[PDB]
Amino acid sequence: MPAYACQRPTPLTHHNTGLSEALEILAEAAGFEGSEGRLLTFCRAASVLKALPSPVTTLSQLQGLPHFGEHSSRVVQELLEHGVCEEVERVRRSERYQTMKLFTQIFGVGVKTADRWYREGLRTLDDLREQPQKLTQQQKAGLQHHQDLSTPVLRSDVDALQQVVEEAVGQALPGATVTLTGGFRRGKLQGHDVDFLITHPKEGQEAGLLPRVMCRLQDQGLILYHQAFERSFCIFRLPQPGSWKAVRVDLVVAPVSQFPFALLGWTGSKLFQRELRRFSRKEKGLWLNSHGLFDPEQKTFFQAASEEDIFRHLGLEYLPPEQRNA
DNA sequence: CGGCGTACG
DNA sequence: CGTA
DNA sequence: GCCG
Ligand SMILES: Nc1ccn([C@H]2C[C@H](O)[C@@H](COP(=O)(O)NP(=O)(O)OP(=O)(O)O)O2)c(=O)n1
Ligand SMILES: [Cl-]
Ligand SMILES: [Cl-]
Ligand SMILES: [Cl-]
Ligand SMILES: [Mg+2]
Ligand SMILES: [Mg+2]
Ligand code: NA
Numbered sequence: 001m002p003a004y005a006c007q008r009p010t011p012l013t014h015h016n017t018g019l020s021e022a023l024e025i026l027a028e029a030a031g032f033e034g035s036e037g038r039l040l041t042f043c044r045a046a047s048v049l050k051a052l053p054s055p056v057t058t059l060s061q062l063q064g065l066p067h068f069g070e071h072s073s074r075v076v077q078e079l080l081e082h083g084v085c086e087e088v089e090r091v092r093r094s095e096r097y098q099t100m101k102l103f104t105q106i107f108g109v110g111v112k113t114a115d116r117w118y119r120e121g122l123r124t125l126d127d128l129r130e131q132p133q134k135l136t137q138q139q140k141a142g143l144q145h146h147q148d149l150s151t152p153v154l155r156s157d158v159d160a161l162q163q164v165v166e167e168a169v170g171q172a173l174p175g176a177t178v179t180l181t182g183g184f185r186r187g188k189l190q191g192h193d194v195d196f197l198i199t200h201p202k203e204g205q206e207a208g209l210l211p212r213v214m215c216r217l218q219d220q221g222l223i224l225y226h227q228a229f230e231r232s233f234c235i236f237r238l239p240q241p242g243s244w245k246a247v248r249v250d251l252v253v254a255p256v257s258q259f260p261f262a263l264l265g266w267t268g269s270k271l272f273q274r275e276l277r278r279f280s281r282k283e284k285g286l287w288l289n290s291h292g293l294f295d296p297e298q299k300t301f302f303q304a305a306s307e308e309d310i311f312r313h314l315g316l317e318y319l320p321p322e323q324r325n326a
Numbered sequence: 327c328g329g330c331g332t333a334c335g
Numbered sequence: 336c337g338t339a
Numbered sequence: 340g341c342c343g
C-alpha cells in the first residue's frame with residue numbers, strides 16, 4: 001500500500017464504505033475548525049480503506065497501512081467492536097458540525113463565512129434570508145436556489161445538458177469541443193454539479209471563448225446565475241417534466257496544449273489531485289497544476305499530448321479516471 | 327520538527 | 336473572500 | 340493527524 005493516493009487504484013465503490021464515511025466525518029469537522037493538517041490525514045486514511053481489496057475485519061489488518069496512527073485506528077476499532085464510534089456520533093449531532101455543514105453547502109459560502117455567521121448566532125437558512133443585506137449577490141443566488149442545488153444531478157441529465165452547451169460552444173467558435181469531466185468522468189452516477197472542459201484543436205483559437213459562450217447561453221434563457229475569464233461557475237436551468245430545476249454547471253477553457261493538464265485536474269478526485277501535486281513536487285521535484293508541469297531546475301515545461309503522458313513523466317502507473325476516486 | 331496543492335473569479 |  |  002503506497003503512501004500517496006496517486007500511486008494506487010481507488011475505485012468508486014469498495015469494501016470499506018462504512019469505515020471511510022466515518023473517517024471523512026472527522027475530516028470534514030477538522031476543516032470546519034481550520035485544521036487542514038488533520039483533515040488531510042483523515043481524508044488520506046479514509047482513501048487507503050477505499051483502495052483495499054476486501055473489508056477490514058480486525059484491527060491487526062491496519063498494521064503497516066499508511067496514515068493510520070493512534071487516532072484513526074481507534075476510530076476503526078470502535079466501529080469494528082460496536083458498529084459506532086462515539087467521537088464520530090458526537091460530531092454528527094453537534095450544533096457546530098450541523099450548522100457549519102448547512103452553511104458551507106451554500107454556493108458562495110465558505111468555512112470562514114459560515115464560522116463568522118455561527119459566532120454571530122445564526123443557525124438556519126431562514127436566519128440568513130431574514131438579513132439579506134449581509135449577503136453577496138453570489139450568496140443570494142446560492143441561498144435562493146439552495147433546495148434545487150441540494151438534489152443530486154443525475155447522469156441521465158448530463159447528455160441533454162452537454163448538447164445545449166455544445167450548441168452554444170459551436171456558435172461561439174466552430175470546431176470547439178466540450179468534454180465531460182469532474183465526478184461523472186470518474187464513473188459517478190450522481191453529482192453536485194456538471195463540469196465541462198472546452199478547447200479547440202488550433203492553439204490560440206480558444207482565447208476569449210468563454211465570454212462568448214456565456215453570452216449565448218444567457219441569450220437562450222438557460223443561465224439563472226453567473227458572475228476576460230476562463231472559468232465560469234453558473235446555475236443552469238435544466239428541463240424537468242412539466243417544469244425545470246436549477247443545476248450547478250462549471251465551464252473551463254484551456255488551450256489544446258494544456259488540455260491534458262486541465263482534463264487531469266478537473267477529473268479529480270479532489271484528494272487525488274492534491275496528492276498528485278504533492279507527489280510531483282516532493283518526490284519528483286516538478287510543479288504540477290491544471291496548466292502544465294514545470295521543471296524548476298531546467299526552467300522548462302513538459303509537453304503532454306495525453307493524460308498518459310503526464311503519468312509517465314511523473315513515473316506513475318497510469319490510472320484511468322474510474323480508478324482516481326481517492 | 328515542517329509540511330500539508332495550486333490554481334482562477 | 337469566493338470558486339474548481 | 341500523520342509522514343519522513
Ligand atoms: N478544491 C478543488 C476542487 C475541485 N478540484 C478538481 C477535482 C474535482 O474532481 C474537479 C471538479 O470539482 P467538483 O465539481 O467540485 N467535484 P466532483 O466533480 O469531483 O464531484 P461533485 O461534488 O461535483 O459531484 O475539480 C480540485 O482539484 N480542487
Ligand atoms: Cl491541523
Ligand atoms: Cl518550456
Ligand atoms: Cl490549477
Ligand atoms: Mg463536479
Ligand atoms: Mg465543479
Ligand atoms: Na459553499
